[PDB]
Design a protein around this ligand. Sequence first.
Ligand SMILES: O[C@@H]1[C@H](O)[C@H](O)CO[C@H]1O
Length: 271
Amino acid sequence: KDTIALVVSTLNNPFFVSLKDGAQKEADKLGYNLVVLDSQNNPAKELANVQDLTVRGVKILLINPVDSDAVGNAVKMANQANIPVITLDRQATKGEVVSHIASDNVLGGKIAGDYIAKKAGEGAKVIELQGIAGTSAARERGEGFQQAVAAHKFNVLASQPADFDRIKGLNVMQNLLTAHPDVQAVFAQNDEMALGALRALQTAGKSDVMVVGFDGTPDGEKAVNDGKLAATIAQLPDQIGAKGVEVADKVLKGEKVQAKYPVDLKLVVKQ
Ligand SMILES: O[C@@H]1[C@H](O)[C@H](O)CO[C@H]1O
């Protein structure tokens, strides 16, 4: 079997476990060996892993950067080895990349803000919990949300990163609530942060504050159905993973591959 490598930012997040599962299923179907290396949200690890894979002479690198700015040197190493690179979910700011497969995260952030305007109103007092700085996902969601802040004249009380992490989201939101008890709505750039924020708000007696997440993870979907999470923006991580392999196969066969394969997003609310 030929080997495709998948270098994933972390497997401590259900979104990325699903991404890996889609890649694996597709690899199995197309007859490739898939080597999955977990970067553990660590730029040093990501670099070591890519170096290892380039010396193993993998045929294609699928990479979900830890940091879109920091991954340039890892990608240049694959470039020097003539191993084509396909980015999944997050972009590489520098380096040669054959194809990028991700959600329209600008649109996602706009959709999230637009729903907050629908339910909390024009001029709502909002807090944004940002993802990992340096990731195109967080940057784009922030851009999309700012479009909503402008459109609907939101009062942004605070916008701070909680690193796509549930516990950080809890600690950051707890902290922000003390400064800004008048918050009316929160946009958390993933469901893990959203669920942390929800826990901080319940603790402070502010469970009336509307929260919108991102990803539509099983825990996000459950939280919507339970009435705790106002909404989430559903992504299709299995499809991002699968497409990565499908395009890797294409590249290897010399077929023409798009520079970008956008993957659909969907506002999810309780039915
Ligand atoms: O798209 C992904 C998901 O939102 C994940 O939960 C965090 O990283 C982003 O890049």
